[PDB]
């Protein structure tokens, strides 16, 4: 009559690493490293992402005609750009403080595109039919949907001074442009004044612009430039434009609302009818694991990103079926 | 192991014992069979569960973290941002791999320790009424039915009860 004391062995092939010995077969274990994703763009906690399609941030904000127009009011959980955004700034020029604007948009959750300065008529005695070939649409020469090219009417460019009072109850992003002709001849043929100026002022904002005439290398078949500027009009505040030439006036502005846990990503994936608490540019992660080696860029409640290819923790014993 | 039990003087594990991590295998006239020790097993389960949970808990939820953009005249800030991201990444990968390794070692050693502890408990319960035939087994100097085996398993062995018979057979 005999009795023995022994331990559990099963049939698992799970291998873990230790400090003294690598690659040890054990009976039970758990994996703390998530490496799987569905490769889809999903809703985040019930809210669909804002897809810009062919446009990037700049192209959408300015109103590139080549991009399919969005609904007037939109709400999202995160913003998506396509890697090959061919549509952006279609008229050559520098977009000032563009990156800071992106950062501002990273905490924005909703927008309302409204007509701040109606085409007819906020700028009397000026021509608002200005178009260009660089911003073409359906073959024809066109222009930004949100901006307006105020030129000379009947051989004169009268000094305009208009203003908007923000009664939306939210921040109002306002964008405008400043045109820079290559020569003084065009400057006169467009704005009739070689000494033009544009003045934009609010409570906290204050800037003056001057036409800089210079022959510049052809970009998109344009030797002239067009610098783009923006500001955030606080609720109740008033924005004032006052110019006598070279002003690419605003037409549509954006009413913005702030939200948390949002951001911008550059993804190649497509939108599916699905939902997740964690989203990466490669796809959605559905996991409660503490780590993930999929992608550094994460939006929502996600595991921490690491470079590890294996994180397996042992729970059972050293498996010895022999 | 570290305590010399598992893969030590007890060379292999029992595929037969499927109801627990640690246990017994008895052999008497009534027959033979495996039977896990539920107490030690439960303790180990609780400990390791708390360990795992404790490792998952120490890692907070990684909320929204997206990249930023910099123009041609902000290369410095760009490289700084990269320095930050890369640094944090290095540190966390390091911590993860290291912690997992350490906890694995400590886990295996913990199992080993549990097995040795159980063995010593049984040994101290039986005393000189049986002999260590090696390989973590004991041969009785008397007859032991299922009731006796159960008395050994659940920690209620009666030494003076079989003391005489054992002494006689020991000679």
């Amino acid at each position: 009559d005999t009795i023995c004391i022994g331990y559990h062995a099963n049939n698992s092939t799970d291998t873990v690493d230790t400090v003294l010995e690598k690659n040890v077969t054990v009976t039970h274990s758990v994996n703390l490293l998530e490496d799987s994703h569905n490769g889809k763009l999903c809703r985040l906690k019930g809210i669909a992402p804002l897809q810009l399609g062919k446009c990037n941030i700049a192209g959408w904000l300015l109103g590139n005609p080549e991009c399919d127009p969005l609904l007037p009011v939109r709400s999202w959980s995160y913003i998506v750009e396509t890697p090959n955004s061919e549509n952006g700034i279609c008229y050559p020029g520098d977009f000032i403080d563009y990156e800071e604007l992106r950062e501002q948009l990273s905490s924005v959750s909703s927008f309302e595109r409204f007509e701040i300065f109606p085409k007819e008529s906020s700028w009397p005695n000026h021509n608002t039919n200005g178009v260009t070939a660089a911003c073409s649409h359906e073959g024809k020469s066109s222009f930004y949907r949100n901006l307006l090219w105020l030129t000379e009417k009947e051989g004169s460019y009268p000094k305009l001074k208009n203003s908007y009072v923000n009664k939306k109850g939210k921040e109002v992003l306002v964008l405008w442009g400043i045109h820079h002709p290559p020569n003084s001849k065009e400057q006169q043929n467009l704005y009739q004044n070689e000494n033009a100026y544009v003045s934009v002022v609010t409570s906290n904002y204050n800037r003056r612009f001057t036409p800089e005439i210079a022959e510049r290398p052809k970009v998109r078949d344009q030797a002239g430039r067009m610098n783009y500027y923006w500001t955030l009009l606080k609720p109740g505040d008033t924005i004032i434009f006052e110019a006598n030439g070279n002003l690419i006036a605003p037409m549509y502005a954006f009413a913005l609302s702030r939200g948390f846990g949002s951001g911008i990503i550059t993804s190649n994936a497509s939108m599916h009818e699905c939902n997740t608490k964690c989203q990466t540019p490669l796809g959605a992660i559905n996991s409660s694991l503490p780590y993930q080696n999929i992608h550094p860029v994460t939006i929502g409640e996600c595991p921490k990103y690491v470079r590890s290819a294996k994180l397996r923790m042992v729970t059972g014993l050293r498996n010895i079926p022999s | 192991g570290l305590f010399g039990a598992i893969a030590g003087f007890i060379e292999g594990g029992w595929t037969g014992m499927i109801d627990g991590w640690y246990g017994y295998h008895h052999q008497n006239e009534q027959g033979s069979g495996y039977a896990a020790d539920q107490k030690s097993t439960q303790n180990a389960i609780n400990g390791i569960t708390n360990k795992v949970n404790t490792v998952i808990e120490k890692m907070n939820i990684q909320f929204t973290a997206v990249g930023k953009e910099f123009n041609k005249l902000e290369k410095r800030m760009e490289n700084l941002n990269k320095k930050v991201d890369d640094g944090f990444l290095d540190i966390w990968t390091y911590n993860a791999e290291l912690l997992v390794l350490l906890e694995n070692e400590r886990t295996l050693d913990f199992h080993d320790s549990n097995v040795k502890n159980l063995y010593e408990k049984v040994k101290s319960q039986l005393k000189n009424n049986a002999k260590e035939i090696g390989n973590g087994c004991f041969e009785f100097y008397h007859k032991c039915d299922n009731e006796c085996m159960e008395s050994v398993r659940n920690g209620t062995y009666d030494y003076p009860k079989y003391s005489e018979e054992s002494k006689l057979n020991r000679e």
């Binding site: 039970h28 059972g316 | 539920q38 097993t41 439960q42 389960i45 569960t49 998952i56």
Partner: peptide, 11 residues
């Protein structure tokens, strides 16, 4: 989380 490794654990 729980390690349900045996059917009689207490988890």
């Amino acid at each position: 989380x729980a390690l349900e490794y045996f059917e009689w654990l207490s988890x």
